[PDB]
Design a binder for this molecule. Structure first.
Ligand SMILES: *[C@@H]1O[C@H](CO)[C@@H](O)[C@H](O)[C@H]1NC(C)=O
Ligand SMILES: *[C@@H]1O[C@H](CO)[C@@H](O)[C@H](O)[C@H]1NC(C)=O
Ligand SMILES: *[C@@H]1O[C@H](CO)[C@@H](O)[C@H](O)[C@H]1NC(C)=O
Ligand SMILES: OC[C@@H](O)[C@@H](O)CO
Ligand SMILES: OC[C@@H](O)[C@@H](O)CO
Ligand SMILES: OC[C@@H](O)[C@@H](O)CO
Ligand SMILES: OC[C@@H](O)[C@@H](O)CO
Ligand SMILES: OC[C@@H](O)[C@@H](O)CO
Ligand SMILES: OC[C@@H](O)[C@@H](O)CO
Lengths: 607, 607, 607
């Protein structure tokens, strides 16, 4: 009669474990260990980049503006028939004697042009010396001086003098620049000077390049300049270089090549650069700038660079400087500065430090820092993102490896310990612990130290009926603790006798009995729900919902890291920068060289 | 006789816990809490960058091409002895009266050159006015017009006229550009005009810079232009500026400085910029562009910028625009736009939003958004990678901190709860729970609420023999549940009597007995394996391998994040860009100024 | 009398669970599954970028330097009154007949200038042919040749010859460059040639642009050049282009447009580019370069590009090359190369591979790789950081999602399994398991398969006294196992009788008794500590500290990922690059065009 109302469940006939099949629990696994901690060397670091700025220096030009006009007069009007313009060099001798000495220039110009020695007379008059005045003030320009402010033109009546010669002697202070390898240079005027800024006579200067004839170049020793405005002469003297070109004479103070140019530029000072050896490479990290560089395990000889004699000295100045402001107390140096070549073409100067705390290895370390110890130009990349990605990935990589490492270690330690809990629980309830461990409904029992298991058998719910009395009629005072049941293995078969174990297990022997008692209330797992009993008499049925639920579970909500799309982004596009410069040479040239195609006629022949 | 076959194990004699040493389990620890959730302000944002484009405007040049040729004739041939070329300005008056009015130019040119007032006659003939025609079509150029298409040269017979003057009046529409601070400017021709585009007479224009004499500049009020092709005059008038230079007269419509130039440029519009205050700085995040900026907690006054009056207005236009298309319904604004200065030199306009949902704080928030509330130019960096690294690290940082936080919280909660399981397991098996907790083989027993522990003693395996009967001969019906054993503490010593506890513990008192029974099968942990018994009679030995193994362990395979190396990578190297421009000025100059060293002789004097 | 010394605790009177309230444990939850594993296609890849380099080619210029000087002599001096300089084209005919054939030039120059046909005579003497010599050696320049090295000037006595004409015929080998769309081009001299490099007569060359008159251009078929130094003529012939401009004639070998220019440039070869379809886009990853690109699911037709016929062929050459060196053995290709357009404007050529191992799908896959299968110019971004961020985030994203996924899965599996432990522990100690699960001090007991719970009641410590005898006087031989106690529910109330359960639970019925015994030592949780008993006689009190503590906890120390700030960092700032070029055009122009404002007088009129 009484069948389960919660049809939606399963019953299991669990054979007495014959003893034929025996299993053992797996015993505590070897658990991993926290990885060996990587050692970091503390240090001061200076990072260098390829130098891309020109060598820059001061020069002074000496030339005269020569103009020869050809004039012609009509009735109440005059026209230029021509205007000759040229630039002429001031001779060495006039620069020293006249100008530098007295601040004066000759009113005539005499130089070589088109293979001729030529002479021009201001106003076509007799030669004098003229005083030099500042050029009219102009915004953002270096200093200039000139003698003449007007262009001389012949008057209408001078019928034997239809040409008019002007001379304006000009001195200018100009910036000069020279690209590596400093074989020639330019002035601020746009004029190329095809001689090394480092060319000269003394100390292997005569090595450097010159495209000129020897007499175009003078090197004046013990030279004292004389400001042309203050009229004051310098306190110390220089080695004054002068080169006369066809259009100007240019002076400059001679200084040595190697102490003046360097192929590398200091880019970053880093207080704490962390050095950690691994992978056959060193790695250098700076959290200050969030950058990580990677060099070979061997030092890079500073002697291997061309014109790299700013590096050695640039490193130390800043280091000593930093070490003072940060380490002189808590720390000391270790060994003499080292140099390594990072990918990206960076050059790192590194000063190993040491806290007095670990002073015990001073003697130890002082050796190691000398094992990596020991011509070309280094191309540095424009983008540092790689070393910054490297830094970021690394920092994030190590962190999760560590905390997930630690997690994993605990998990194992926790499996090992809970076994002990299962070892006691097996004995209390072998069928359930077996069923769960083994991973299928089984019947089990201890055979000493191992467990026997037999595989259960399913029975339906329409194939399962319940008896409404747990009271043993013949033996009053004695009662079934749980309920009795009848069932059929298949939907239509002999109905069997047994009692309801836990978890809908159908137990064959009705052998589980207690001494009866009063108040008897019970709830017995029955199908998808519970069956209820008062005083060993079947009362009614229920569903799990009909009972409040509490949990034996510890909570944990993990959510995944969302997908994210990184779109291209640039502060200024390649064209914005192409459009930032005021004048564009290509554009101007193109336009200019359209003048005659646009406005005139380049093909027609008249005659 | 019977010694263990699995020699590879250890036995422990466990003293009865004297009671001398008592321990307690540690009780539930205080478990951490999920960090206080950081609040995000929703907003619309506009980000600005340093402006690096020139101020660009339209101008018109007026000048005439003047050519004076000098010719000479041989028998059946003629040669140029010279060609004078010059550019002359069109006077103010001719520009207005002749050109703008009628589209005509005078055929003569009269201007000042080299301190002379000079006059040129097309064909050296009498003055007329000539019509202006478009310049011959050219690809990609602005508009031009000219009067003359041929160069006038004197014919062979004209023996009293060996010079030939040409005049070609030219008007061009050209682009003009001016860099900050807009004190001078350039034309598309390459010509510098050394006067502010904003120079003029009205409203403090006369403030701006001019390098010219006053009469070179005219400001024509109520000016109506007349297209020189359509012949149509403009519908409205302008304030027309004209400056006569020595080589051309240049006009342009006068417009005010402050409403025409801005030192900042809008770069990004962001619908949702998230504002979260922390660390004494704000942070602004955009997932749309994956960028995170960092500003001080105080607003940056828009009045603090020079010529920054595009910013205020540029912000609002887009915002109102965005707020409409996205927030007018679900949201409202909060307070008046604010401005902050990010590192990298970015300027963020931010419009705080609010969902009608949280409208309850409208009154609250409306105050907070006014606490940070209130000359120089801002340099913006070219690289945004920092703010994008920042964004990425932050998003990844917060996520693991959170899920590992949650993990940690559960772990603790799980240790606290399982204790309760150990508290029941201690009572069932004190030696084992003690041994594991304590972390060494001990003997234990409850002394009420605390546990007593004594440290066990090791015994070898050759020092351990087993008895092959668990049947008590004298007391049939009574039997040992486990096996009896004999052993010696040291390899050669008095053989002791006791029985085999669990886990190879050697128990001294042979006191563990049961009522005998039938079918008796048992397996007892013996050395590295098990000892087997049927009916209280020793049968044989086994190894763990000889028994199938199931596991009481939950699985978890963590693998570490692999090491990864980020190599330098650039879309175009610094040289590729240096090689992208069609013409290179430095290169051309260098080459050109080699012409005479290469092809001619600059030193030889003839005479 | 005896009250607890550790006042700092709580006692609970736990009502016998009336049975009124029943709960059930929650049963095993459904646990999540490891996400479906994403499939990666192995491949070879070639990535292309917008081409930004000019089309570069070789040309040869032919022109003559013509100089006409005007001289004048004073007593012991001479002055240049003028110097006419011009460049004249070499006619087509002289280039072929004289130069190319014999390495000679005519000593006269005849070309059109200013609408006149003009003729110049070296030394004003009769015409000859002159031999061509190399230009004087110059560092880093292409080849040149000239006929004349001196400038001819008339001597002092030649009173009927005051002008002096020089001619220097010049040939140069120059680089020429042309920007897209290759309509005009430039020479190394700075000269614009306003004709397509691809202009010509044959095969639709006459399509291309020319700004010149037809007779300025010749196309010489079957042309054999003759080195002007080695005097050796080429082994094969070319289609020689010649264009005469007003200032020079320029030759070059004609080659077809489409096979000579390409709008795209190969940037990267990638051995393993991993292709994984998701989100309606493909993704392409390279660990070699740590870059991830994102394209639409459909192929991008190579026929869609303008002048993109370098791409098809450039792809295969490298691929076949790579496939050989890496895949020909372990792998094979799959389908014909495909092309996709990534964001950032990158173009990826991809060759799908396949290990012989999975050869079983060769037939399957061979179809799929053909489903995405099929004019403008592509702008590529300068910054690749996005695709590298993308790559890094993705790799880090997937990893934590995976290991935290796996973690979560275990956690659940572990909650499910431990329930079974709680199911056995409930029966051993219902009050404690109830109290913990339920989450408040309760009293509990099994009612079959569910648990009854009643909520306990707090009692103070001053409200709790202890009896110093556990020995039952009237029933010697029988003794309380734990202690007896008296207490009051409120500070001043009837003192109640009961005994001390565990965990400071006050049990009402003094029903827990044992048979007395000897040695009796006990410790009973009492307040914040323990109460101690020897032989059922109260001895003294203690604190937890007074007892050593061991732990039932597995350890786990998680630390959070630190906050990190990424500061802007650039290898070279925008100005450093602006300052890297030797000569600056804008600067030079500005300065130059200050010459007269600085040094002369542009306003004063004399007469
Ligand atoms: C390291 O050494 C190898 C060969 O020894 C060389 O090819 C490589 O360029 C070096 N790299 C660096 C970072 O110095
Ligand atoms: C923030 O304030 C400090 C001093 O108050 C200043 O030095 C710093 O430049 C400011 N930074 C920003 C991002 O405005
Ligand atoms: C993908 O397709 C959409 C429309 O179909 C188009 O707007 C978008 O530009 C395409 N993106 C790529 C990466 O090709
Ligand atoms: O006047 C001496 C000075 O010019 C030194 O440089 C020489 O070595
Ligand atoms: O060819 C140069 C010409 O275009 C300029 O002088 C116009 O101003
Ligand atoms: O014609 C009037 C117009 O030029 C205004 O700009 C004057 O303010
Ligand atoms: O000095 C200028 C010269 O090199 C060019 O005119 C050659 O074309
Ligand atoms: O001499 C033949 C050669 O110039 C070929 O290019 C013609 O197609
Ligand atoms: O205007 C050109 C002038 O500044 C230079 O020639 C000076 O060298």
């Amino acid at each position: 009669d009484i069948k389960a109302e919660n049809t939606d469940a399963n019953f299991y006939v669990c054979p007495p474990p014959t003893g034929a099949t025996v299993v053992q629990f797996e015993q505590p696994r070897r658990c991993p260990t926290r990885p060996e901690g990587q050692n970091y060397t503390e240090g001061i670091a200076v990072v260098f980049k390829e130098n891309i700025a020109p060598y820059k220096f001061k020069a002074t030009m000496y030339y005269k503006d020569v103009t020869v006009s050809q004039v012609r007069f009509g009735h109440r009007y005059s026209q230029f028939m021509g205007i000759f313009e040229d630039r002429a060099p001031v001779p060495f001798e006039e620069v020293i004697d006249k100008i530098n000495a007295k601040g004066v220039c000759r009113s005539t110009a005499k130089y070589v042009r088109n293979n001729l020695e030529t002479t021009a007379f201001h106003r076509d008059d007799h030669e004098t010396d003229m005083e030099l005045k500042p050029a009219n003030a102009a915004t953002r320009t270096s200093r200039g001086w000139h003698t003449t402010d007007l262009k001389y033109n012949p008057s209408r009546v001078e019928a034997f003098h239809r040409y008019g010669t002007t001379v304006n002697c000009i001195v200018e202070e100009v910036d000069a620049r020279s690209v590596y390898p400093y074989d020639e240079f330019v002035l601020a005027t746009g004029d190329f000077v095809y001689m090394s800024p480092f060319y000269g006579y003394r100390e292997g200067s005569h090595t450097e390049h010159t495209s000129y004839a020897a007499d175009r170049f003078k090197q004046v020793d013990g030279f004292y300049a004389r400001d042309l405005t203050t009229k004051a002469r310098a306190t110390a003297p220089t080695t004054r270089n002068l080169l006369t070109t066809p259009k100007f004479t240019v002076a400059w103070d001679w200084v040595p090549k190697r102490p003046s140019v360097c192929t590398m530029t200091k880019w970053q000072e880093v207080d704490e650069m962390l050095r950690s050896e691994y992978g056959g490479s060193f790695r250098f990290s700076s959290d200050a700038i969030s950058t990580t560089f990677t060099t070979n395990l061997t030092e890079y000889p500073l002697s291997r660079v061309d014109l790299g004699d700013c590096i050695g000295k640039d490193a130390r100045d800043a280091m000593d400087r930093i070490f003072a402001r940060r380490y002189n107390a808590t720390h000391i140096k270790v060994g003499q500065p080292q140099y390594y070549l990072a990918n990206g073409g960076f050059l790192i100067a590194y000063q190993p430090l040491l806290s007095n705390t670990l002073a015990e290895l001073y003697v130890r370390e002082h050796l190691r820092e000398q094992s990596r110890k020991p011509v070309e130009r280094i191309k540095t990349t424009s983008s540092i993102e790689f070393a910054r990605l490297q830094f970021t990935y690394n920092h994030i990589q190590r962190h999760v490896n560590d905390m997930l490492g630690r997690v994993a270690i605990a998990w194992c330690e926790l499996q090992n310990h809970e076994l002990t809990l299962w070892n006691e629980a097996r004995k209390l309830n072998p069928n359930a612990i077996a069923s769960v461990t083994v991973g299928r409904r089984v019947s089990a029992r201890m055979l000493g130290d191992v467990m026997a298991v037999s595989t259960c058998v399913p029975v339906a719910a329409d194939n399962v009926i319940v008896q409404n009395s747990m009271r043993i009629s013949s033996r009053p005072g004695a009662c079934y603790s749980r309920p009795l049941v009848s069932f059929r293995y298949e939907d239509q078969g002999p109905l069997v006798e047994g009692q309801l174990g836990e978890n809908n297990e159908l137990r064959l022997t009705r052998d589980a009995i207690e001494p009866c008692t009063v108040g008897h209330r019970r709830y017995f797992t029955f199908g998808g729900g519970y069956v209820y009993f008062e005083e060993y008499a079947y009362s009614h049925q229920l569903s799990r919902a009909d009972i409040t639920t509490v949990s034996t579970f510890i909570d944990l909500n993990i959510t995944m890291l969302e997908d994210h799309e990184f779109v291209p982004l640039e502060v200024y596009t390649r064209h914005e920068i192409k459009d930032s410069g005021l004048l564009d040479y290509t554009e101007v040239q193109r336009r200019n060289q359209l003048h005659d195609l646009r406005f005139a006629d380049i093909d027609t022949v008249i005659h």
